[PDB]
Amino acid sequence: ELLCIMRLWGHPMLTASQAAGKVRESMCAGKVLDFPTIMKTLAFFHTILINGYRRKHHG
C-alpha cells in the first residue's frame, strides 16, 4: 500500500533532449553477435513450435 501511494507526486515536465538522448544511446553498443546461443535458441524455438503444433492437434 505504501508503495502504491508513494506514486502520488505527479510526473516530471518533459523535454525532447533527455529521452531522445537515451533512446539514441540505444544506438550502436557493440555488434556482439553470438552464433552459438542464437542457433541453440532457434533450435529450441523450432522444438517448442513442433511439440505445440503436435499437441494442439491429433498431430
Binding site: 556482439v32 553477435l33 553470438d34 552464433f35 552459438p36
Partner: peptide
C-alpha cells in the same frame, strides 16, 4: 592402398572437427 583409405578417413574426421571448432563461436 587401403591404408591410404584410412588416411582419407583421418582427413575427413580432422576436417570436420577443425571446421566445427571453427564455426562454433564468433
Amino acid at each position: 592402398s587401403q591404408s591410404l583409405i584410412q588416411t582419407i578417413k583421418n582427413d575427413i574426421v580432422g576436417l570436420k572437427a577443425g571446421m566445427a571448432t571453427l564455426e562454433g563461436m564468433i
